[PDB]
Design a protein around this nucleic acid. Sequence first.
RNA 1: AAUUGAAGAGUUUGAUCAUGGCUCAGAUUGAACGCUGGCGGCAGGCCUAACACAUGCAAGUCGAACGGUAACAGGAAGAAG
Length: 150
Amino acid sequence: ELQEKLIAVNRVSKTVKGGRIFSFTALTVVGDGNGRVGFGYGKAREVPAAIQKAMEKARRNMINVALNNGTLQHPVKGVHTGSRVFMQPASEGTGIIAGGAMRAVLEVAGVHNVLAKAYGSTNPINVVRATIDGLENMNSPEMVAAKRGK
RNA sequence: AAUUGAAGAGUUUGAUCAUGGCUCAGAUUGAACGCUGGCGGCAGGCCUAACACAUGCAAGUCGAACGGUAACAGGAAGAAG
């Protein structure tokens, strides 16, 4: 019931004294399938150590999302660095139809059938960060009615 | 009951993030070309030279408008084997 999946692995470099030194970065997202989404970055010298650090950071640093029946509630826009992201609840608008690196976080998030369209930059490290910010500041009808009295 | 509706990716760098262009994945067509080709249904078929046109048809009808008889088939009368 953990439901982990990796989005992006890259080879970064460092350029020391004698030549270059190549390191690998993972970027994974875990989530239970009912709210509870996390992402982790993690970087290491080989690929399986990188994904393992990424999963291990992603299992902690996990955020609650106030889902609807199987989906979002109201249309929400989350931004991070250069990466602006729209989402629309699509009240059984079948299938998760999101961009790459947004399909994954929305998939393990437990949502099933939203409409997305990322704008701006679509770097995978910042398009999540713009989905969680997004799903984090999406509030439910029992939270809005809690705030404003009824 | 009559709008249930939105996906990205590759490429600037030793690597990064951003900006930014180029390019790809889709659908479409009065299409052409290449390879191949069994049947049917429904549609479509000179986008260019509003260039030049052989030949055949594409606008005739009415005698219940009229003088009339060129034919065709009868009618009447005459003459002949």
